[PDB]
Amino acid sequence: AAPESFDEVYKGRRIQGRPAGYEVFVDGVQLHVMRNADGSWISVVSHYDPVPTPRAAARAAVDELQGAPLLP
């Protein structure tokens, strides 16, 4: 089973996740994310530092973006 979906405002940005394997969006723009075999997650904004969940990957991406719009 995929993780549960989520929807919240984090550091002023809307982050959403939903099973598809799994999609994440930052202000409506899709963030490429990936699941590792141990169940951790990474994203194209933070690829080398695994985090436990897709919401943690979305938050790490917002942290790294420092307000920048994500590009498709």
Partner: protein, 273 residues
Amino acid sequence: TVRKNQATLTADEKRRFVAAVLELKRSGRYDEFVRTHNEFIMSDTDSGERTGHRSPSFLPWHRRFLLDFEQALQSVDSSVTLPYWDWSADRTVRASLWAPDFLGGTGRSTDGRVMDGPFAASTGNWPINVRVDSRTYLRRSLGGSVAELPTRAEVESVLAISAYDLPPYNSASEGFRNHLEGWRGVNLHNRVHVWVGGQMATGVSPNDPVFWLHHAYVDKLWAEWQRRHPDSAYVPTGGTPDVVDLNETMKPWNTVRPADLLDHTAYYTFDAL
């Protein structure tokens, strides 16, 4: 050709390397290396087709990718070769690597923007074009997201590991490849990406020229492992779905196998191995 420790380059060698990298950027060639790397970092998965990373072909794939880059540099200045960054030895922000006459330093604290060296956005010579967000300037946060670079003793603990790789041949593996890549254990290569920060921590990490120097030292560590373990060799050796077996060809080139890349001396040697 000899690949030299960056720390050892003369001022003229550093100048010629920087100029050649800036000319690959100016001509549009550099960005297509960034794009190719990103395509594999996004498509390689632990449960599916995997070639450039999280898989035994991480090492021969990057060996070929770096050769492609070095050949492009040599097409600009035939005297230039790719240097390597021994992050176990040159491990602080004060290292000559990060001086304004070579790669420039860390990013300023407000937005991570690199403010000095040849690749600083203010020069007009290093636009970030292949990117995942609106920012078009080189960023770094050296030592920001992780405390320390690996040490020589951590590197030796990984070199000691005799299996090249092991099923399931992905980020969950035991063995040398996945400990060097860093998804398990004390973490070598992934941690260096995290330590540099900025674009190096992202899926468009060749945007920072240090990418190539980091991967040239990862490539040297494979060569060191091979001399430590003469009776150990690339695996798997056939019939593995989704994984590049020893005599299978690799994307994107399609015309080279891991078998063709095991012996680096066919293409270059190191200043000392």
